[PDB]
Design a protein around this ligand. Structure first.
Ligand SMILES: CCCCCCCCCCCCC(=O)O[C@@H](COC(=O)CCC)COP(=O)(O)O[C@H]1[C@H](O)[C@@H](O)[C@@H](O)[C@@H](O)[C@@H]1O
Ligand SMILES: CCCCCCCCCCCCC(=O)O[C@@H](COC(=O)CCC)COP(=O)(O)O[C@H]1[C@H](O)[C@@H](O)[C@@H](O)[C@@H](O)[C@@H]1O
Ligand SMILES: CCCCCCCCCC(=O)O[C@H](COC(=O)CCCCCCC)COP(=O)(O)OCCN
Ligand SMILES: CCCCCCCCCC(=O)O[C@H](COC(=O)CCCCCCC)COP(=O)(O)OCCN
Ligand code: NA
Ligand code: NA
Lengths: 533, 75, 80, 159, 80
C-alpha cells in the first residue's frame, strides 16, 4: 500500500478496478485482500484528482463495472459491506449521486447503477434502510441530490417503479386503480414537505442560489401538482386576506399623513374634537405597523443568517419593507424630539409604502410575470447603463463648471441637474447669457447630447437581444419559485394546529413489508388519461 | 419662524428676507446675499472685435450667435 | 400599475408641499402626469419649505416611470 | 488604412495629449484661450475611461457594441441627415432673411432643436411669407421622424 | 486565415513507430473517466521572427477569420 500523501491508501484492488481487469480482482480477493481499504491520498479527495468514495466498492460502482460490484458484495471469501462509510461520511449511494453531471449518458448510467445497487442491497439485507443513512452533513441521497442540483437523479428518485416480488416496497410510485383510457397513480411523498431535518421543498426553496438548476427542479411531476394543490386549498385565502389588511393599513396611513397639522414645533396638543381623535387614532395605527414590520424583518434575518451576499440577490422585499419601517421609526424619534424634519422622513416611508404593494402581484400570474420582468431588467442591465452614464455625466459636468463659473454653473450639483434635464428632454438651449467662453460651450453641449443619445440607443438595442425566447421562458419559472417560497413561508408558522397542509392520509400502499408489519405512506393522488392502450 | 443668513435653508424652513437673501441649489444650501449689479467696463471686447472665444462683449454691446462672432451694438 | 404608482407619489407630494399647485390631489396628479409626456416643469423657482427633498422625490418618480415604460415596450416584443 | 479602421484608443489618447500640450503652449504665451484647450483635454479624458472596460467580461461586450454601432451604422445616417438638414436650412434662410434666420448657423441650430424635442412652433413673429414657413417646418419635422424610425428599425434588423 | 489547416496542425496527433515525434498533442496520464493531455506550444509564444499569437493579433484586418482563429483548442486556454 502506498504511504505517500499523494497516493496514500491506494492498494492493488483500486488498480485492478482501474484497469477493468476481473482476473486480478478475483486473485486479490482470493488471497485475502482487504476490500474495505480506503484510498486516502490527496489524488483521491474531493485541483487534480478524482473522488469516488475512497473504497473499491464505490470505485467499481462509479466506473460502471457492474460485474465487479456483484462479485464484491457476494464473494465467499470476504463480501464487502454495503453500508460502509468513507472519511467524509458518504456511502456508495452518496458517491454515485456525486458523480452525476446531468448529461444524458451519465444520467442513464447513474440511474441504472443506483437502481441495481439498491435492489441487490435490499435482497442481501432486507432489514437495512440503506437509503436513510445520512452523511456527516446530515443529508440523505435524495436531500444531497436536491441540494447539489442533480436534477437528473432527483427526477428518477421521486418517481421510481420497481415491479419485482419482495422489492415493490422500495418504489415510491404506484397505481391505485385503473379503468380503460383513465387511471389513477399514487405517489409516496415521504420527506418531501415535513421531515424535521431537511425536506426537498425546504432544500430547493432556501438554497444559496448557486445551484444551476434551482428553477428547474420544481418542474417535476409531483412537486408542481403538490404546490398547486397547496395554493388552491388554504393558502390563497390567507394571502388575499393579508393583501386586504395591507391595503387598509396604507389607506389609514395616507389619510393620517394627508391631514397633518400645519403648525410648527411638535408634539401637538390633542384637541377635544372628533376629527382630531380620528387623526390621532390614525397616527397610532400608522406607527404600530412600522413596529410590526421592524420585528418581522429582524425575525427573517435571525432564522436564515445569509452570508452578506444573497441579501441583494434574493429576498429583496424583506429589505424594502425593513427600510420602510426604519423610516417610520426615525419619523417617530424626530417627532418626539421637537424637530420639524420628521415630515421629511414620513413622506419617504409613505412614498415607498405604495411601491412595496407590488409585492402582492404574486398569486396573480398575469401580473407576477410582469413584475418579475421589471425586477430582472432593473437588476441586470440598467445597473451597467447607470454606471457608464454617471461616469460620463460627471466628466462633462466637471468640464462645464471649469469653463463657465457663474450663472447656474458655479457648482457641480446644479450643473449635474441641468445636464441631466437633457436626458429627460427639457433642456435650456437658449445661450442668451453673455459668457466669456460662448461658442465653446455650445460644442460641449452638442457633443454631450449626441453621445448621450448614442448611449440610450445602444441600451435599447441591447435589451432586444434578450427577447428571443430568453426572458419569456425564464420569468415563468422564477414566478413559480416565488409562489413556492411564499407558500412555504405561510405553511411554516401557521400557529393553529396544522391539519390542512397534509396529503391524502395514512393510505395502505402495500401492507406487506419484509416482516409481518404493514405500511402507510401518506400518499398523493394524481389521475391520468392515456389513449395509447 | 424662518432661516437667517448662514443657516441651512430648504430642509424644513425658508429664508424670510427674499429681497436681500436667496437660498441656493447646493444640496445643503445656506442663504447668502445678492451681489451688486456692477457693469463690465474692462477686460471685455469692443465693437468690431471677436466675441465668445475667451472674452465677453462689454456692457454696452451684445454678442451674436455664430461660430466666430463679433461684438455689435444691440438695437 | 401606473395609476397606483402615480397615486402614491401624488399623495406623498401633496403631503410634503401644501401650497403652490400642490395643495390638491387633482392638480398634483395632472402636474405629475405631464412628466410622462415630456412636458415637465423642473424649474424650482418657488421657495418651498422642503426643497431638496421635493427634488429627490421628483427624480425618483421620473426614473421609475421611464423604467416602467421601457419594460412595457420590451414586454410587447414577446407578441411579435 | 489600418489606423482608420483599427487601434482607435491609441489615437484618442494621443489627441488628448495633443490638447494638453497646446494648452501648455497657450498658457506660457499669455493667452487666456488655453482654457478652451484644457477643458477639451478634460472632457474626453473622462470618456477614455471606457478603454478600461476590457478585462471585465460584462462591460467589455457592452463597450464593443457601442463602438461597433457607432462606426458601422450611425455614420450613414449622419451623412443622410446632415445633407437633408443643410437643404432645408438653406431653404428657410432663403425664405425668411431677417430675425433668427438671417444666418445659416442659427437656422441649423434652430432646426436641430426639433430633433431633440425642444422646438419652437409658436409662430408669433409677423413674417412676410408666413403660412409657407409653416408648411416647410411641418414637412421637415415629419421627414425627420420618418428617417429616425427607419434607422431604428434597420438597427433592429442587426440583432 | 486558413483556419481549417491551422486547427489540424496545432492538434496534430499520430501513434505510429518512428512518427510519434511529429505529434503536437500528447497524453501525460489517465484515470478511469479523466485524462490529462499536453500540447506542444513551441513557436506560438516566442519565435523572434514570426509567432502565431503575434501574426494573428497584429494582422492587417484583411484576414477573413482573424476573429475565429483564437477559438482553437490550445490558444483559448493559453490566453486565459
Ligand atoms: C422612493 C424610492 C423607491 C425605490 C423603490 C424601487 C422599486 C420598488 C419595487 C418593489 C417590488 C417589491 C418586490 O417584489 O421585490 C423585488 C425587488 O425589486 C428590486 O429589484 C429592488 C431593487 C432595489 C423582487 O425581490 P424578491 O424578494 O422577489 O427576489 C427574487 C426572489 O423572490 C426569487 O425567488 C428569485 O430568487 C429572484 O431571483 C429574486 O430576485
Ligand atoms: C469631446 C468629444 C469626445 C468624442 C469621443 C467619441 C467617442 C469616444 C469613445 C471612446 C472609446 C475608446 C475606445 O475604446 O476605442 C474603441 C473604438 O471606439 C471609438 O473610438 C469610436 C470612434 C468613433 C476601441 O477601439 P479599438 O482600439 O479596441 O480597436 C478595435 C480592435 O481592438 C478590435 O480587435 C476590432 O478590430 C475592432 O474592429 C477595432 O475597432
Ligand atoms: C441622477 C442625476 C441627478 C444627479 C444630481 C446629483 C449630482 C451629483 C452631486 C455631487 O456630486 O456634488 C456633491 C454633492 O454630493 C451629494 O450631495 C450626494 C450625491 C451622491 C451621488 C448620487 C448619484 C445619483 C458636492 O456638492 P455639495 O452638496 O457637497 O456642496 C455643498 C457645499 N459646497
Ligand atoms: C448639428 C447641428 C448644428 C450644425 C451647425 C453647423 C452649420 C455650419 C454652417 C456654416 O457654414 O457656418 C460656418 C462654418 O461652419 C463651421 O464652423 C464648421 C462646420 C463643420 C461641420 C460640422 C458637422 C456637424 C461658421 O462660420 P460663421 O457663420 O460663424 O461666419 C463667421 C464670419 N467670420
Ligand atoms: Na420628447
Ligand atoms: Na419636450
Amino acid at each position: 500500500s502506498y504511504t505517500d500523501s499523494y497516493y496514500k491508501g491506494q492498494t492493488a484492488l483500486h488498480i485492478a478496478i482501474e484497469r477493468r481487469n476481473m482476473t486480478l480482482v478475483t486473485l486479490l480477493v482470493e488471497n485475502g485482500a482487504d476490500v474495505q481499504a480506503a484510498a486516502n491520498g490527496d489524488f483521491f479527495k474531493k485541483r487534480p484528482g478524482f473522488y469516488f468514495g475512497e473504497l473499491p466498492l464505490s470505485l467499481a460502482a462509479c466506473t460502471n463495472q457492474l460485474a465487479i460490484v456483484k462479485f464484491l458484495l457476494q464473494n465467499s471469501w470476504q463480501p464487502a459491506d454495503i453500508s460502509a462509510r468513507d472519511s467524509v461520511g458518504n456511502t456508495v449511494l452518496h458517491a454515485l449521486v456525486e458523480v452525476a453531471d446531468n448529461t444524458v449518458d451519465n444520467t442513464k448510467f447513474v440511474t441504472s447503477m443506483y437502481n441495481e445497487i439498491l435492489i441487490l442491497g435490499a435482497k442481501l439485507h432486507p432489514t437495512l434502510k440503506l437509503e436513510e443513512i445520512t452523511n456527516r452533513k446530515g443529508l440523505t441521497p435524495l436531500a444531497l441530490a436536491a441540494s447539489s442540483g442533480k436534477i437528473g437523479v432527483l427526477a428518477y428518485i421521486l418517481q421510481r417503479e420497481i415491479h419485482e416480488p419482495e422489492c415493490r416496497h422500495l418504489s415510491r410510485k404506484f397505481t391505485e386503480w385503473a379503468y380503460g383510457p383513465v387511471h389513477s397513480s399514487l405517489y409516496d411523498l415521504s420527506c418531501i414537505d415535513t421531515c424535521e431535518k431537511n425536506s426537498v421543498l425546504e432544500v430547493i426553496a432556501y438554497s444559496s442560489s448557486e445551484t444551476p438548476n434551482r428553477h428547474d427542479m420544481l418542474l417535476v411531476e409531483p412537486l408542481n401538482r403538490l404546490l398547486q394543490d397547496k395554493w388552491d386549498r388554504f393558502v390563497k385565502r390567507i394571502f388575499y386576506f393579508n393583501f386586504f389588511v395591507y391595503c387598509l393599513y396604507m389607506i389609514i396611513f395616507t389619510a393620517a399623513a394627508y391631514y397633518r397639522p400645519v403648525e410648527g414645533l411638535p408634539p401637538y396638543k390633542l384637541k377635544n374634537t372628533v376629527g382630531d381623535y380620528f387623526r390621532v387614532t390614525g397616527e397610532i395605527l400608522s406607527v404600530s405597523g412600522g413596529v410590526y414590520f421592524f420585528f418581522r424583518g429582524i425575525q427573517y434575518f435571525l432564522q436564515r443568517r445569509p452570508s452578506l451576499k444573497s441579501l441583494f440577490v434574493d429576498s429583496y422585499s424583506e429589505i424594502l419593507f425593513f427600510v420602510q419601517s426604519l423610516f417610520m421609526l426615525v419619523s417617530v424619534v424626530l417627532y418626539f424630539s421637537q424637530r420639524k424634519e420628521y415630515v421629511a422622513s414620513m413622506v419617504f416611508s409613505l412614498a415607498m409604502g405604495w411601491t412595496n404593494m407590488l409585492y402582492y402581484t404574486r398569486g396573480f400570474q398575469q401580473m407576477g410575470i410582469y413584475a418579475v420582468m421589471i425586477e430582472k431588467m432593473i437588476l441586470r442591465d440598467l445597473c451597467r447603463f447607470m454606471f457608464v452614464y454617471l461616469v460620463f455625466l460627471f466628466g462633462f459636468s466637471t468640464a462645464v463648471v471649469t469653463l463657465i463659473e457663474d450663472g447656474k454653473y458655479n457648482s457641480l450639483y446644479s450643473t449635474c441637474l441641468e445636464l441631466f434635464k437633457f436626458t429627460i428632454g427639457m433642456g435650456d438651449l437658449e445661450f442668451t447669457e453673455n459668457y466669456d467662453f460662448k461658442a465653446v460651450f455650445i460644442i460641449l453641449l452638442l457633443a454631450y447630447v449626441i453621445l448621450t443619445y448614442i448611449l440610450l440607443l445602444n441600451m435599447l438595442i441591447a435589451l432586444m437581444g434578450e427577447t428571443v425566447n430568453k426572458i419569456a421562458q425564464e420569468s415563468k419559472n422564477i414566478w413559480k419559485l416565488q409562489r413556492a417560497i411564499t407558500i412555504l413561508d405561510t405553511e411554516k408558522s401557521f400557529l393553529k394546529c396544522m391539519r390542512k397542509a397534509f396529503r391524502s392520509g395514512k393510505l395502505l400502499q402495500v401492507g406487506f413489508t419484509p416482516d409481518g408489519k404493514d405500511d402507510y405512506r401518506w400518499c398523493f393522488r394524481v389521475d391520468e388519461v392515456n389513449w395509447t392502450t | 419662524d424662518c432661516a437667517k443668513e448662514g443657516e441651512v435653508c430648504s430642509w424644513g424652513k425658508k429664508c424670510c428676507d427674499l429681497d436681500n437673501f436667496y437660498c441656493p441649489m447646493e444640496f445643503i444650501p445656506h442663504c447668502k446675499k445678492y451681489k451688486p449689479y456692477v457693469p463690465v467696463t474692462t477686460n471685455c471686447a469692443k465693437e468690431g472685435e471677436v466675441c465668445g472665444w475667451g472674452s465677453k462683449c462689454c456692457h454696452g454691446l451684445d454678442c451674436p450667435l455664430a461660430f466666430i462672432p463679433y461684438c455689435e451694438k444691440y438695437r
